[PDB]
Design a protein around this ligand. Structure first.
Ligand SMILES: O=C(Nc1cccc(-c2nnn[nH]2)c1)c1cccc(C(F)(F)F)c1
Ligand SMILES: O=C(Nc1cccc(-c2nnn[nH]2)c1)c1cccc(C(F)(F)F)c1
Ligand SMILES: O=C(Nc1cccc(-c2nnn[nH]2)c1)c1cccc(C(F)(F)F)c1
Ligand SMILES: O=C(Nc1cccc(-c2nnn[nH]2)c1)c1cccc(C(F)(F)F)c1
Length: 260
């Protein structure tokens, strides 16, 4: 029934919608196009920050390690990094900037700390995600071309990974709490999944967008009185210059919430 509602939303949206919900109260899933590939865009920033948190388990000072920010490093969306050009940010600062402000320069420093987009993929594989692939750096990982396998995952795989990272044992306890704290402090998410939820349903999320009107969000949610949920909503459209549709994500989330 919920799949039929998501189908109706998708049909009136003009685009292609992917949804994965895990309800941790019972482990049950709702999936819509759950095994189709979608471009991740900045939702991939969660995997890169989590990989750096995992590194920090064996290097307790890692998050205070300074990283030089040079003029040439700046890319196309650098609201935090631009303040630090010719200076340094720590890996904690870059993680917070990437996750909470979606800073693309900050993401690039995370990727570099992992040895390139392949290192981020390696971390995903290590935590049991056989699906995620990061192929490119910022900003080109957001080209979101239909059919292109690069920088994609499926909603099912991303939900299962987000659950392991934020609620399971993929990370040490400190690190898990740090990741959840960062997601719950996101600045960019009030129009997306969380717009479709009751106000009482606490949450953290990471948005993404790109060409092809691609509009994404992944969230960990604490519904009032209930065990947490993990929700992935991915959306992409047929034309390169299509406009973002955060409202579609909100609509998906609302359908999911009403179906619980
Ligand atoms: O804990 C899990 N499931 C679950 C669901 C409902 C109840 C319980 C439970 N009740 N009492 N002790 N565990 C556990 C669980 C299953 C797969 C994966 C994960 C993980 F690690 F969070 F991703 C957790
Ligand atoms: O799914 C369950 N546990 C589970 C399964 C697989 C992985 C994990 C898990 N991985 N990391 N942390 N928990 C937990 C689960 C669900 C209801 C009830 C129970 C219980 F408590 F054993 F009876 C377990
Ligand atoms: O700034 C954003 N996108 C962006 C940045 C730079 C270039 C372009 C772009 N160039 N050509 N087509 N889009 C888009 C952007 C979009 C939605 C949401 C956010 C935010 F605020 F970080 F969450 C940023
Ligand atoms: O970098 C891009 N967008 C962007 C940048 C930073 C943050 C976000 C964003 N955050 N939350 N939702 N989107 C999007 C971007 C957009 C269109 C096209 C391209 C590309 F791939 F370079 F051509 C990049």
């Amino acid at each position: 029934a919920v799949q039929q509602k998501l189908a109706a939303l998708e049909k009136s949206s003009g685009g292609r919608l992917g949804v994965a919900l895990i309800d941790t109260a019972d482990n049950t899933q709702v999936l819509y196009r759950g095994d189709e590939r979608f471009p991740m865009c900045s939702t991939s920033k969660v995997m890169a920050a989590a990989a750096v948190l995992k590194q920090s388990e064996t290097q307790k000072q890692l998050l205070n390690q300074p990283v030089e920010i040079k003029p040439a490093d700046l890319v196309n969306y650098n609201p935090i990094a631009e303040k630090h050009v010719n200076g340094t940010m720590t890996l904690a600062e870059l993680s917070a900037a990437a996750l909470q402000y979606s800073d693309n320069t900050a993401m690039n420093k995370l990727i570099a700390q992992l040895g390139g987009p392949g290192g981020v993929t390696a971390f995903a594989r290590a935590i049991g995600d056989e699906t995620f692939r990061l192929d490119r750096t910022e900003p080109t990982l957001n080209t979101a071309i239909p059919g292109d396998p690069r920088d994609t995952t499926t909603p099912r795989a991303m939900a299962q990974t987000l659950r392991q990272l934020t609620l399971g044992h993929a990370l040490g306890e400190t690190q898990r709490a740090q990741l959840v704290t960062w997601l719950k402090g996101n600045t960019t998410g009030a129009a997306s999944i969380r717009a479709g939820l009751p106000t009482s349903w606490t949450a953290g999320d990471k948005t993404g967008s790109g060409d092809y009107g691609t509009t994404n969000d992944i969230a960990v949610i604490w519904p009032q009185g209930r065990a947490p949920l993990v929700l992935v909503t991915y959306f992409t459209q047929p034309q390169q210059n299509a406009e973002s549709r955060r409202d579609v994500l909100a609509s998906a989330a609302r359908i999911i919430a009403e179906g619980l």
